Amino acid sequence: KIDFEYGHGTMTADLPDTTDIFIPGETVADPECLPEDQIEAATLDSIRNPLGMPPLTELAKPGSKVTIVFPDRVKGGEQATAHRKVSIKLILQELYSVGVKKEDILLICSNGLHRKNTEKEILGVLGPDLYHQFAPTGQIINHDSEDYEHLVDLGKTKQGDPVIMNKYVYESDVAILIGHTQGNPYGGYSGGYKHCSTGITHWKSIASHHVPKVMHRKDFVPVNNNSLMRHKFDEIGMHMEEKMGKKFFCCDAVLDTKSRQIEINSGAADEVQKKAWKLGNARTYVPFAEKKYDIIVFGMPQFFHYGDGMGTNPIMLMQALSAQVIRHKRIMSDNCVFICASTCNGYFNESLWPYLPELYDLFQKEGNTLVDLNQYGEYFATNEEYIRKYRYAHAFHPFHGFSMISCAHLAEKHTAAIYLVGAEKPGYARGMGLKTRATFEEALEDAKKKFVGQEPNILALPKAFKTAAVHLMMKNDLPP
Amino acid sequence: KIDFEYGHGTMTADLPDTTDIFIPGETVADPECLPEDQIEAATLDSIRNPLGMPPLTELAKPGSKVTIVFPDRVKGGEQATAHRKVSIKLILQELYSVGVKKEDILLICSNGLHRKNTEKEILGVLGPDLYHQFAPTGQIINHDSEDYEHLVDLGKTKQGDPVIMNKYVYESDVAILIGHTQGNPYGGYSGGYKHCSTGITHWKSIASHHVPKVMHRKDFVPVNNNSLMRHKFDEIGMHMEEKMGKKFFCCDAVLDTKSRQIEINSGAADEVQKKAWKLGNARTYVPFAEKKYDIIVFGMPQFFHYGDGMGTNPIMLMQALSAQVIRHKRIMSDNCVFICASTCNGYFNESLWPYLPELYDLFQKEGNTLVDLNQYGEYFATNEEYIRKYRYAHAFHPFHGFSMISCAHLAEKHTAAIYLVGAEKPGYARGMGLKTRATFEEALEDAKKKFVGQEPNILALPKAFKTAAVHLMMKNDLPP
Amino acid sequence: KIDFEYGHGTMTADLPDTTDIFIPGETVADPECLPEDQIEAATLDSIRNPLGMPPLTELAKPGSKVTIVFPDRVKGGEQATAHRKVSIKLILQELYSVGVKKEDILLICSNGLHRKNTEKEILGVLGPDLYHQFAPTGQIINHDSEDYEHLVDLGKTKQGDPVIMNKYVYESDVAILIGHTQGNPYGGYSGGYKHCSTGITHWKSIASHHVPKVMHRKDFVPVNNNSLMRHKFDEIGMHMEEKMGKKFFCCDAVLDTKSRQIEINSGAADEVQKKAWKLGNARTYVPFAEKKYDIIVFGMPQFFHYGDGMGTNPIMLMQALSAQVIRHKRIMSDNCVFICASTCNGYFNESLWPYLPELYDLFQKEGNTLVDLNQYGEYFATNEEYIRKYRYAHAFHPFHGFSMISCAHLAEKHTAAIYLVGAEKPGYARGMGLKTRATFEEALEDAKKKFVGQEPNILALPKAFKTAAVHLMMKNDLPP
Amino acid sequence: KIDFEYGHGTMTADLPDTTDIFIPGETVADPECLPEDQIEAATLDSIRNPLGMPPLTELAKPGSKVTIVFPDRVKGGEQATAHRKVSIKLILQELYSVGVKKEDILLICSNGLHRKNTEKEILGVLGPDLYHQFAPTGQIINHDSEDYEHLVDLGKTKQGDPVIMNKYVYESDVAILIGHTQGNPYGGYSGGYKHCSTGITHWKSIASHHVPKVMHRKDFVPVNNNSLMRHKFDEIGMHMEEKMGKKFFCCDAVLDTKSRQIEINSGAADEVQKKAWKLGNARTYVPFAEKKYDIIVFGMPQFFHYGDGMGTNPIMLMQALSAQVIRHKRIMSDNCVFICASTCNGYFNESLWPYLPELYDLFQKEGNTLVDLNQYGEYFATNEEYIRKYRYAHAFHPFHGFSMISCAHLAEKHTAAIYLVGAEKPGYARGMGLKTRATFEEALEDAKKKFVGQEPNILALPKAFKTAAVHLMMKNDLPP
Ligand SMILES: *C(=S)c1cc(C(=O)S)c[n+]([C@@H]2O[C@H](COP(=O)(O)O)[C@@H](O)[C@H]2O)c1
Ligand SMILES: *C(=S)c1cc(C(=O)S)c[n+]([C@@H]2O[C@H](COP(=O)(O)O)[C@@H](O)[C@H]2O)c1
Ligand SMILES: *C(=S)c1cc(C(=O)S)c[n+]([C@@H]2O[C@H](COP(=O)(O)O)[C@@H](O)[C@H]2O)c1
Ligand SMILES: *C(=S)c1cc(C(=O)S)c[n+]([C@@H]2O[C@H](COP(=O)(O)O)[C@@H](O)[C@H]2O)c1
Ligand code: NI
Ligand code: NI
Ligand code: NI
Ligand code: NI
């Protein structure tokens, strides 16, 4: 009896007593996070002694325009001592010390193609103090990847990747990036060059890497720190750095499963990435599996990663399954079977993803596999209604969904079969290529009969999505 | 490089040179069909010398009411020397020899839950001679399982099985069942007791055996001559014989893969079944395979079996896949993979199956598997509009579709995965639980990577639905 | 420059000066119609001296139930001296002369499958005298072919023809059929045995002869007095006479092109038909053409024959074209081309023919030719909503439309091509299989280029539908 | 017994034994294709020895911008030694030899109003080597006739033809057109000035000749080499040539039925056309017919020419019929009949042609003939949704459909009747003015009865659309 996430709660699975249960942070201890009394001091020390650039004192002159670009509510923590709040607070104190005016500081939420964070979401992300400091003056803005008035086209990179970036960050004298060095199937880790290359860029810039051309090759599944997606992240980052004539001050903190800071690294994006990747690999790449697992059992809540309906939207849940594939491919056998509890009730969450019903209909009409949809990316990404919903209705940018399906296809690709149990509308899961069973037990027996045999190595991931999911490797494997 | 049925033509698969190809009737020779000149003599000898039941001349008095119940266009063949035409002509000659009035003979098409054969279809089935002999007088009637003015309820059997049969057959004094002892996933063979128990019955009688409670038991896959399905067929047949006060004259011919008569058997249904079962097993239960087959590759044409759209309608498509499962389970590995070519263009053929769009939508809304739909059988079977379309619009009876899903779930249950290639609308195939690939090669590589390994035993089945399919067994297997 | 019917008016065709113009009743003189002064005297003499049946005075006992079945507004005259009004008035006077009670007389409008005539239409048909004499007491009833409470099933005929007739006519003691001997594509002439067999029967009785099985044989085009259609008419008529125990008093008047009486024939239906055949052939079978006509040019008004939309509804449009084919087949060349003006504006007249939009949609969905629709006849004929609209909303009976398409296919079958000119919505005409051109000149040039050559024999038929059409034959042809 | 294309396969026709069967390349031997070992050498010799201009070495300076404009997947073949792949490879080698940088070379797919080729289609067209060489850097772009950022308006010609052309080709120092001098009803042949005038121009430029005002005159049907369409092609080509100050280097190869190279010619467009014209006339204009054919029998596959649904979309199907008309006018009698097998199942392929459902509805509700639609061309061509689907959803440009109907009208104009055989939804074929018959035999008998007589000259074209269809002439006719 193992409880797995099911929509809003838990559904029980009668898994065998030999099933291995892994919970991030719990089953294998993450690197010890900084104590609460020490988190602020560590962040201040990181800011005051950066890597690859002089501190914010030398970079910022009195009266200089400063853009502090912080990540949205998808990643990071919202506690009183969260990395975003503490880091932005001490960075603002440092800026005020050197004479940088408060009215000349812009807090930019790096949603990128994700939904623009609402006022309450921004308040929760930044904390009451920072929000009430900057929101009344309009000094907290969500990045708009479709507001070309506040976007600068920087041309293409040496590899042909277009670069359109946030105008406030472009014209600012000091661009600071609050980042979380958390485990991410997209490029290995969040923050660093990924933060700038995605959260404050265009869908066209993101289309260079968030496509099957780079995330359906060998280097993406399982993810590493030197995949093509991360390479394009770095390329776009340094391209914008050359275009502005300045480099991003990347205040990035490695976070544990509970989004608590383990270490904080500030300075140059590449220096910060290199310095933080050691602890990021100690926390994210967990050598836990003693044997390859034939069945991976987990549960999908309705609201884990990108908001409500993330575990009920067929495309969003397929992308979550694919993210699990990228995370645990190192411990997955060739014929691995995913058994996921999801309330696939047809709740697409059109408020969050208005384009996803039409993307799903396009997949049903044309696509044998989700990769067949990639040709329509721009078609959604230039859709005026979806663009308007992203810009004003706090919806995800349309092209994000293609990134989603660009990830989601790996779920169909790298698993023998994926079982979705408890689907209230199993037709949507089947339309995403998932086998549908009413309960965990029937899917378990079906997988044993068809793909994995009567004595499979079953891995249970009860908190696969409600927690910061680590990427599992073999016990003898070393963190890449 | 093997062509497989695909819509109205063929799709070519670049299968490995080690792929074994089986064409029913060509790869393994059928029992030698009777010559065209000898067919009439053999049928006349069988009719004049029936088994375990008095000859037709000894059953019908002058002025007797005779019902010749012939099968519909789905099986039997429509050649000049087809069993239906020749057998009915000789039987009518014998009846006129004992002075049976022509006006007292009714030709009943035993569609059962299948669509009432149109006048053109009846003409093609019976030959111009028989048609223009009996059609202008209105003596050829399609059996109506929903015309209760022409239905007689015989009550429950000894096992509580509801029997409602055609009123013309019940009230006649001589009922002559024209039958084809041909390979059939339902009950082993066609004709005999199955002919009466299905073709001239109510949907409630079919619900007794076409329920998953009888189709999904361990004795149905692969189908044999002693399955529960045939048991209910026989029970309903002898219930008819007891309530009617007369015995069916089962003029049955064993047919090869080209619908040519090999031997004609007349007399009581039980005796005809016992005598013709040996040659039926010789023709159908073919001991061909020397090894278990990991991949079974075939193609689905748009038109086959029940009519147009059978290879495109998702539910009929799954029923055809499950029929293949039933027929070839003896040569299948536990992780067997189906790779079928089907256009799957969303052509439900509402004229043939108007209830099937609603059934598919119900499957998507509620059903994890197709068995979840069975509780709605009566709901479709009593649907007024679908009943009207079956009675007058020459549509299939609604409950027949449930029989299909009752069969079709087996395709999901037994195969590890079924690949559909060439799907114009892959969404319907995926909503049936099928993996969708654009071409045969992609599905083959996917099956090799996921289920069967890089060196699978691949069986090619070209014309698997164009010709009368056989039940493939291992070389050392004995015919049931 | 000849004006042809077009919607509510005329369209001019710049036909060659060699075009022959035929106007029924004008180009060839009709038999001299009875002048208004002696019309009453002739009708009274015919009624008092019937043919092969006793006079009405010798048939109706005092206080006996009498049903006067008069035809609807589709055919016959509506003037003061119209056959229906005068004949019914004189018959009622004769009945009152022998003491037959006024209350015991029922005036039945024999619509059959045609729309029940409204109270206004019944008044116009019967005259104010007869209407206000019998309407206020409810003694004028439209025949309801779907009011089984007022229908009597007489069973199949000797030819297997189902007969269900009006209950009032069946249960009456004297049934008097008012009839018009006029040019009719159905059965040669109207009235007589056709009157009873169609105007007061069930749709099942009409289905015996109004299907392609009877309308599309070689003996129907051109139509005569010895076609199979007339044979079924006679068989159903004598079946009605035999089951009733009484003989129809067929008070029939031969009508010219202006619906004026030429001679009145009363008595048995067979004897009346024999007596009136000569003058019916003289009026209808006109030997006018001295050569075969390659192009037949006529115009279709919006209102004619069955009512509004007849020239605009695609199916009634094809039925009118096929009626023209049937009437003018004797003068038609093998490759004859019809060029018809019609406002094919998509006005289906759902009030008149609610089943016809569905019938046309079915034809587009699966009908290569209109005969492909015949299998659905009962499906429309048993449709509850269409039956309700026929019974209460004064709509045509659904199966009547099938009769129309049963006729209408002839237009497709016999003409090389039919050109519709002036169609506001040419798509409906094309979906009926008609070539569409904007003007008469374009269609004429197209027909000359494609089928008939640059010097065709063009026949102009203005008012081909406004006047009672004739069956044109060659000058040397004899009248059947 | 001749098999003609039907949907995804073939259907059989019981044509008379006197029916003449023509297959391009097979029935009449095409000019001998260049051997595979000699194709590359001949292409290199052609590029190194151009006509009308100096070679690419003398035209391209080191660092000069070069646009290699290649045709889409519709024609040209995709074999390993196809003209596009080999020609582009050797041309790139020559450019690298003279010092032209790889980053300064743009591979432009000249889709024109045709759908932008997807990444997979571009890969298949160009070969894996060329694709992976230029695709990752974004150096392969589809021509966008609606991206005015990358379009240059060159004004009108001397005849008022608007000229808007691809901006990359305009600003490039060397424009190299890869061309296929294969049979084409549009202007006689592809490549040369047609390639530039259509594949990299605006819909407004194409509207000068793709309207009925140009392709419905005497010269277009039958197509010749001096038709007005080719004249306007030449005019637009030289207009763009003078506008850029450079002339197109037309590397054009003549192709056989199997798209294999027969002769490769490079240099100026007019000189290339003149040189390749003899081979193009030898391969394309085949003097095969000994007598004019009253019936031409062929069949449409679902996929051919412009993609999926070409044989099922009613407008696309009718345009294919018209292309056959233009191809075989020289061997076609005045009362010619087309009998084409097509699965006219209503599959419009909205993905390929989203505007064609609404264009078809416009034809049904307004158009007597297809020319009546031409006034709405710009209305579709400026439709924002259809433009977006062409630009991003890989759909055909809207105005292309009008070109299609501009061709398609000839099918109605130059044939007495066209019989569409086996239509699943015959209403669409009838709405395109085509006679619909269920089987080949029905259409054959109908055509014999109506248009061509009982002993017609029947031509069979079993591979009319699955191969590069030649234009047939009389055996005494010289190639124009
Ligand atoms: C990672 S792929 C990523 C992608 C996007 C897109 O728009 S696609 C946006 N972001 C934003 O960058 C911040 C932190 O990155 P993380 O990897 O999501 O944790 C955050 O604001 C993201 O929304 C990231
Ligand atoms: C087989 S299970 C079967 C089922 C039905 C139903 O209605 S369910 C009807 N029939 C008819 O019986 C005839 C011959 O049987 P066959 O197995 O189809 O060959 C024939 O008329 C069937 O339609 C059979
Ligand atoms: C002629 S076929 C016919 C058919 C019908 C049908 O219902 S179908 C009905 N009637 C009616 O009989 C009366 C006179 O016949 P006529 O040929 O129409 O003049 C008249 O009331 C008809 O409506 C006739
Ligand atoms: C021929 S008329 C033609 C028309 C167009 C239009 O947009 S209309 C486009 N093209 C493209 O030019 C290339 C080769 O020409 P072909 O005649 O098709 O072989 C090719 O890319 C065409 O798509 C041609
Ligand atoms: Ni992203
Ligand atoms: Ni059955
Ligand atoms: Ni009638
Ligand atoms: Ni073109």
Author numbering:
A (entry chain H), B (entry chain A), C (entry chain B), D (entry chain E): 2 to 481
Give the published text.
To generate a LarAH in this subfamily in the holo state, we cloned the gene for a homolog of LarABw from S. plurextorum, a pathogen of swine, which shares 72% identical residues with LarABw, and we co-expressed the C-terminal strep-tagged protein with LarB/C/D/E in L. lactis. Importantly, the purified protein exhibited a yellowbrown color, which is consistent with the holo state of LarAHs. Like LarABw, LarASp also assembles as an octamer that is a tetrameric dimer, and the monomeric protein has a putative active site between the N- and C-domains. Arg431 (equivalent to Arg434 in LarABw) forms multiple hydrogen bonds with the same set of residues from the other protomer as in LarABw at the dimerization interface, suggesting that the tail-to-tail dimer is common in this LarA subfamily whereas octamerization may not be so prevalent since the residues at the interface between the neighboring dimers are not conserved. At the active site, a continuous density matches the NPN cofactor. As this density is connected to the side chain of Lys195, the NPN cofactor forms a covalent linkage through a thioamide bond to the enzyme. Like in LarALp and LarAIp, the nickel atom in the NPN cofactor is coordinated to the C4 atom of the pyridinium ring, two sulfur atoms, and the imidazole side chain of His211 in a square-planar coordination. Over the NPN cofactor, we noticed electron density in close proximity to the conserved His115, His306, Tyr307, and His401, occupying a position corresponding to the substrate binding sites of other LarAHs.
